[PDB]
Amino acid sequence: PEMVRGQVFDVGPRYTNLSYIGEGAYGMVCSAYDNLNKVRVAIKKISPFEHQTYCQRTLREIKILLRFRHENIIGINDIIRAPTIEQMKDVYIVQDLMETDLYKLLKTQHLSNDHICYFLYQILRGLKYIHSANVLHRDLKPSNLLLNTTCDLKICDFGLARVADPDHDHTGFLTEYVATRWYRAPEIMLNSKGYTKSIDIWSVGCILAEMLSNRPIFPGKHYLDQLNHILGILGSPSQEDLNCIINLKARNYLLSLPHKNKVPWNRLFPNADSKALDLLDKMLTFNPHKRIEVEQALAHPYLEQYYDPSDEPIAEAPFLDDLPKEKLKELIFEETARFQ
Numbered sequence: 001p002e003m004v005r006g007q008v009f010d011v012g013p014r015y016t017n018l019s020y021i022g023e024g025a026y027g028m029v030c031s032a033y034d035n036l037n038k039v040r041v042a043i044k045k046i047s048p049f050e051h052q053t054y055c056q057r058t059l060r061e062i063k064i065l066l067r068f069r070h071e072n073i074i075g076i077n078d079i080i081r082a083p084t085i086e087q088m089k090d091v092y093i094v095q096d097l098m099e100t101d102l103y104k105l106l107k108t109q110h111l112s113n114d115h116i117c118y119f120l121y122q123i124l125r126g127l128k129y130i131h132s133a134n135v136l137h138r139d140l141k142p143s144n145l146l147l148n149t150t151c152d153l154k155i156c157d158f159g160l161a162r163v164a165d166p167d168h169d170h171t172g173f174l175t176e177y178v179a180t181r182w183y184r185a186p187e188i189m190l191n192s193k194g195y196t197k198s199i200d201i202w203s204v205g206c207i208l209a210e211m212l213s214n215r216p217i218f219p220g221k222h223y224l225d226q227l228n229h230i231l232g233i234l235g236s237p238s239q240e241d242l243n244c245i246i247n248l249k250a251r252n253y254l255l256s257l258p259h260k261n262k263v264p265w266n267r268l269f270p271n272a273d274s275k276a277l278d279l280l281d282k283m284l285t286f287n288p289h290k291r292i293e294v295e296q297a298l299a300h301p302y303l304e305q306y307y308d309p310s311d312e313p314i315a316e317a318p319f320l321d322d323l324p325k326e327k328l329k330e331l332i333f334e335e336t337a338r339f340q
């Protein structure tokens, strides 16, 4: 079994001529030649079996990605693993090879307004499908948006995704949260568990702002600092928006702050298309109930060159968290059986 950059990458004999790409937490990504389809693919090695949390995210990702089928969501082409649970120590997920991701692209490339518009359209088109399945991605950010050489965009990494649960979204002030800090909606720090679709629209708004300037709009350095970056741009919430926050600790925190004025988007982004900034404002709205929804965003004048709801498909049907890692390995084994 051939090796890569230290350890075993046991994918053969269908996949050959491996090249290292990157790493994450418990596994590395390589590119490889698919000897059957005769194209290079991406292969991600996943070693999650010692931890409930890793098994949980792996199962979530596999289950969701196998059920979804959409041009703007990464597919699972194949899954390689041992024939028996006993022998299964790793799982390899084979996906389309994508040249880059939006994080890498934004580090070095200025985006034309035409690219920004196209990228945003594709993000929202994929998100419409995810939300139509009653799923929340919950970790949208540039590094989870893959791009190929012709700039087709695919959303990836569903390891933090959940089924939407708006009736149980409420929580207290300063409740711990897992998803990436800079893309967190203000309500996460105030009174929300991130169980409603508006959590993802906020993240997309952050991504749009970052495409406009190649810099994160709200780069907080720690949990509450994230909220002060948001408020430093949006300004103080209105009385109406405060009244929607019944939790007294969260409301009184906001009332304790000195008044802050809104920074006009066109001062922050003086070269941006005015229609893009109108949509940005609607995505980055403080009150999550007033925030634009995915289907409204697709219909926004900024996206008129691409909008076509008949070509923006939805899921054919909509889609726990306290299971021992043992049942989870069995579940991963079962979920991946179709590829044997």
Ligand SMILES: N=[N+]=NC[C@H]1O[C@@H](n2c(SCCC(=O)NCCN)nc3c(N)ncnc32)[C@H](O)[C@@H]1O
Residues within 6 Å of the ligand: 021, 022, 023, 024, 028, 029, 042, 095, 096, 097, 098, 099, 100, 101, 143, 144, 146, 156, 157
């Ligand atoms: N892990 N790792 N190492 C990252 C490297 O692996 C590349 N990478 C991926 S992982 C993308 C999701 C991810 O890790 N997001 C970080 C926050 N969750 N999928 C690829 C694919 N399908 N084709 C080509 N490269 C692919 C990624 O772009 C980078 O180069």
